[PDB]
Structure formats: structure tokens, C-alpha cells
């Protein structure tokens, strides 16, 4: 049995809508979650499905993988390519690849491949910044970490599924460009690069996270040690910069997109943690990293309410109203794979 079980059960009890097959945005159960965040809650369901050995929770979560998809398709349709936000398309392409791995349901591989191919085949460009995927498919003014590294990750899942080297080539070309043009080369991931004023070196949890995850995935697909080093350097930056003075990961609210970003960070830190624990690579860092992760999980869960819900401000919420994105990160932290 696990604290991850309790945390995921509580999350579903608080925020899941079995009628609309969608998460509520908050504990008042009034409006459903925003499109892209819903794909990140979809992945938390998947993470908890992989983490749990509770037979009731395992079967519920496996069903819920299908339900989340059906709720979203019922509202937004099956074809997300009319969404101007390439990031929206890619967060759901990545979720769909993972759903295929778990379920074997062909609809998910079609959704993943079709949506990924639309973004990468049409939104990759070498005229601005020597490479990279555009943020939007309407106006082309910026290329962003929050599309490019998720795209590398989606490509890696698609290579794992298909064994089509095209997807390894894509993952590698996207990551290589992103490391060059959206990082300092030393683990700091820049938000975006804009035509007018160039690189915007604002780092955040979710962009550290997708860079770490795509580097770990490239390490596993290629065996090239540089990708594991890239992940370690980005984890070091995260733990010394995106933390309070006590070492607890930051709160990036009140921005609605960022406030839940620890969810995506913790998901990807878990991949690095597992690779280093299992391989005995970077043993000094691995030990420090594991201690810091344990410390963060302990501090988050120390601030659970009586319903076992943890607000995303892990430094301290007594207002009675909890949000599903902000609250997700603590559940993710206890469901790492």
C-alpha cells in the first residue's frame, strides 16, 4: 500500500467528474479543467496506474485513461489541429502515445502520430533561429520550450512504439536545437526565443522538466552518455534555482499555466532518479538528488488538508477552495515512475 494510492484516490474524489469524464478545475465542481492541463492530469492518471499495486485503484485508473480521452473528445472533437497553440496539440499527442503504450488501443497511436506529424512536419522551421518548432500555427513570432521539448518527448514515445527511426531522428533534431538555442548549455532552460528580442532566459519547473525527460529518453534510445549528463546538469540547475531558501521547489502561481508546473517537473525528475539509482551513474549526485526529492515530497505532504489534498504552494491553504492543477503536483510526487 502507498501514500500515492491515498493521494490519487483523494484527488479523484475531490476533482473527477464521472458524468462529463473530465476533471473539475477546482473543488467547487463548477467548470472543467483547461484543455492542455487536462492532458497533464491524464498523464497523472497514467503515472498512478503504473505506480499502484492496489487492484481496485489499478483497474479504476486503467478505465479512467479511456474515460479522460472520451470526455475531452466529446467536448473538443478528435482533431485538435485547428487549435492555434502547437503546445496544446503536442501535450495531447504525448498523452496519446502513453495511452497507447498502456492500453494497445489503436485510436491512441493514430491520435499521437497524426497530431505529432502535423506539428513537426508543418511547424519545424530553419529560417528563424536555425531550427525549432513555432509556438503557434497562426502567427510565427516565437519558438518555445513548452512546445519543443514536449515534441521531443512525444517523438521518443512514438519511436519506442513504432521502432520507426524517423521519430528518433525527429526527437534528436528537436532536442539538439533546443539545447543549443533554448538553454545556456549548462542546464538552464530558456522559456522561448522571439524574433524581436531573442532568447528569454526565464526558467520554470515545466520547461526544466520536459528538457530533463527528453534528455533521459534520448539517453535510453541512443546510449549516448551526453544526454544523461544534460539531464543531470538541468536537475542541478533546478534544485539550486527553482527552490525557496530551504530547498523546497518554488510556487510559480498565480500564473494559471505555471502554478501546477511542479506536476510536469516531478514526473520527469522521477525518470532521472530511477535511471541514476538503477545504473549507479553520477553516484554522488544521485544520493544528493534522492535526499532532496524525499525532502520535497515530505514537505509537500506535511501540508495536506483533512481530505489528503495538497495545494501547490508547498511552503504552507486554509481558504477551503483547492484547484486541480495546483493540487496535482503532490499526487504526482507520490506516483513517480
Numbering used by the authors: 38 to 353, 355 to 375
In the authors' words:
In the case of GH76 α‐mannanases, not least because of the potential issues with S‐oligosaccharides described by Belz and colleagues, we chose to synthesise cyclophellitol di‐ and trisaccharides 1 and 2, respectively, and to render the latter less hydrolysable through the incorporation of a carba sugar moiety (as in 3). Having shown that a trisaccharide inhibitor would bind successfully when the enzyme was inactive for normal hydrolysis, we then sought to study the binding of the trisaccharide 3, which we postulated would be non‐hydrolysable by virtue of containing a central carbacycle, to both WT and, as a control, D125 N enzymes. Although crystal structures are clearly indicative that the carbacycle containing inhibitor 3 reacted, as expected, with the wild‐type enzyme, and that 2 only reacts well with the D125 N variant, we sought to verify these structural observations through mass spectrometry in solution. In summary, we have described the rational design of an effective endomannosidase trisaccharide inhibitor composed of two carbasugars: one bearing an epoxide at the reducing end that acts as the electrophile for covalent, irreversible inhibition and one taking up position of an internal mannosides to protect the construct from endomannosidase mediated hydrolysis. Our results thus prove our working hypothesis to bear out: effective mechanism‐based endoglycosidase inhibitors can be designed taking into account stabilization of internal glycosidic linkages through the employment of carbacyclic entities.
GH76 enzymes catalyse the hydrolysis of α‐1,6‐mannans, such as those found in the yeast cell wall, with net retention of anomeric configuration. In 2015 their 3D structure and putative catalytic itinerary were identified revealing ‐ in the case of the Bacillus circulans enzyme ‐ five enzyme subsites “‐3 to +2” (using the described nomenclature) with Asp124 acting as catalytic nucleophile and Asp125 as catalytic acid/base in a classic Koshland double‐displacement reaction. We show, notably through mass spectrometry and high resolution 3‐D structural analyses, how the disaccharide cyclophellitol is indeed a poor inhibitor, but how the trisaccharide versions, in particular the carbasugar‐stabilised one, potently inhibit B. circulans GH76.
